[PDB]
């Protein structure tokens, strides 16, 4: 909607430890943080690029802006992917944040396709073993079932409490700003301000917005960076701070808040029950691992539980006081001797 809160900002490049191939790089899809706070299993991922905006600050759901060296660039939303152990389903996107549902895995990967149609990826260690809502480790989501509490990341692209800060970026070193016009250094600034310092007497350090030529100096005696930035960016742990006490020029809200909702689970089919004095015998069809528990209803409850994997017979002692038996997500069964 109106998420013009990103207009003064830009995406950025940052350290990625596995850009593919088991090698680290400086990535436009560096991951910052993976959240797994919703008990429904949804993952909320933060990346160094911005999703849903052109480089002109205009909103477009089919576009994604990253940084190509010093210049923000447009790219295809359609090329964005999250992969973990096996490909994920992206539920939501806004700026730096991606809502995805992922299979169980140990790495988490996010990538996209740039304008030149190169794949860019980034991968982090991430144990993803989303623990089970209910008492049945099920694998197909049912219609006929019981609903239970859970938490989710809603798809609200708007106006939350949680915030990240956007600052003045630090100066950007770039060796290609300098070339060796034999015997001298030529600083080529494109259309930018360059802060430079050369370790050779005469025209040592300063600023320039024009192509400047420093005399009688070699390129490995000079340091050049792009300064006077006029777009803001997240003060990432993977980027230097521009000033000692930092800077700050704005804030961006974190979409997709954690809301508290309901999830469906199945109920394991009612077990076949046969009876003897002080004894109950139960056949169990788990369609999937189903938890079985039971307790005496006297002073000594003697809790027992086990996960039933496949079809099974269970023989239970029914004391004078009676027995309570919870079979997965069903309501408890109660038995007394006659």
């Amino acid at each position: 909607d109106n998420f013009n809160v990103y207009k003064a900002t830009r995406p950025y490049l940052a350290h990625c430890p596995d850009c593919g191939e088991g090698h680290s790089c400086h990535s436009p899809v560096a991951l910052e943080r993976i959240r797994n706070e919703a008990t429904d299993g949804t993952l909320k991922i933060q990346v160094s690029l911005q999703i849903g905006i052109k480089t002109d600050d205009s909103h477009d759901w089919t576009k994604l802006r990253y940084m190509d060296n010093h210049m923000p660039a447009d790219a295809e939303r359609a090329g964005l992917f999250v992969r973990t152990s096996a490909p994920c389903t992206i539920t939501g996107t806004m700026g730096h944040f991606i809502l995805a549902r992922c299979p169980k895995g140990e790495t988490l990967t996010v990538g996209f396709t740039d304008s030149r149609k190169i794949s860019h990826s980034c991968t982090h260690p991430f144990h993803h073993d989303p623990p089970v809502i209910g008492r049945e480790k099920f694998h197909s989501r049912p219609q006929h079932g019981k609903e239970l509490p859970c938490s989710t990341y809603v798809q609200s692209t708007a106006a939350t409490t949680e915030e990240i800060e956007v600052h003045m970026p630090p100066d950007t070193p770039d060796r290609t700003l300098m070339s060796q016009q034999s015997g001298n250094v030529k600083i080529t600034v494109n259309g930018q301000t360059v802060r430079y310092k050369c370790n050779c007497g005469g025209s040592n350090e300063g600023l320039t917005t024009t192509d400047k030529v420093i005399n009688n100096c070699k390129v490995d005696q000079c340091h050049a960076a792009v300064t006077n930035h006029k777009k803001w960016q997240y003060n990432s742990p993977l980027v230097p701070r521009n000033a000692e006490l930092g800077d700050r020029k704005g804030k961006i809200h974190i979409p997709f808040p954690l809301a508290n909702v309901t999830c469906r689970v199945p109920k394991a089919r009612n077990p076949t029950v046969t009876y003897g004095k002080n004894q109950v015998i139960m056949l169990l069809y788990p369609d999937h691992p189903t938890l079985l528990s039971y307790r005496n209803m006297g002073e000594e409850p003697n809790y027992q539980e086990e996960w039933v994997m496949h079809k099974k017979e269970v023989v239970l002692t029914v004391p004078t006081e009676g027995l309570e038996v919870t079979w997965g997500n069903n309501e408890p069964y109660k038995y007394w001797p006659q």
């Epitope: 003045m168 259309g191 301000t193 350090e205 300063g206 600023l207 320039t208 917005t209 024009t210 400047k212 300064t227 006077n228 930035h229 006029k230 000033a243 000692e244 006490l245």
Partner: antibody, heavy 121, light 109 residues
Amino acid sequence: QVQLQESGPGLVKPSETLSLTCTVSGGSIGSSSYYWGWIRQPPGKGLQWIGSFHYSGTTYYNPSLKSRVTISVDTSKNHFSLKLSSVTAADTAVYYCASRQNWNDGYFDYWGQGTLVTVSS
Amino acid sequence: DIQMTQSPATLSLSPGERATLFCRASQSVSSSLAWYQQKPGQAPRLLIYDASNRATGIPARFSGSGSGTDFTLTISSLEPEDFAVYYCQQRGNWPPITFGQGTRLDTKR
């Protein structure tokens, strides 16, 4: 946001060291501007940039004065300061302290109200 | 070592008129130019920067144009406020930051 006010002796004799204090109001030094600086103006003439102290600690000096100019920041008193050594009558001028808060570029958008410094014996 | 020349030295005009001022650098400074206003006895006041951008709160009648080495300041319709001395500054290649000698906008009568 911030206000700069100069503080100076006014009359300095030759070969002594002119010393000026620009005191900053409404914001701490280390956070209030991208360049602090000193710019002078002799009577009846234009402006001459003397020096600038960048927030990174780099100091940029005018080449015709670098051998005599020191600019420092005292964050314990929110003021930056100029020391111009070995003074002659040409140094007689209105001295301005100035700052650039809004872009990190090399212009000047906040100004003090300059102090006249005369040089004679 | 950038040299800045302003023109004319004196521009004596009546209020409400359009006024135009010229600044020229000894070599290309891209658009890295600024225009400062200074009224007698005061500090310079930043009017224009990067040769076209207007400083915070500067009236919309002020505007700057030009690139390379040749720059124009234009005041759409002079107000009594606007009669002062205008300097141009370079930052295209510094230090040293260098200024022009000024133009004196006198009030005709």
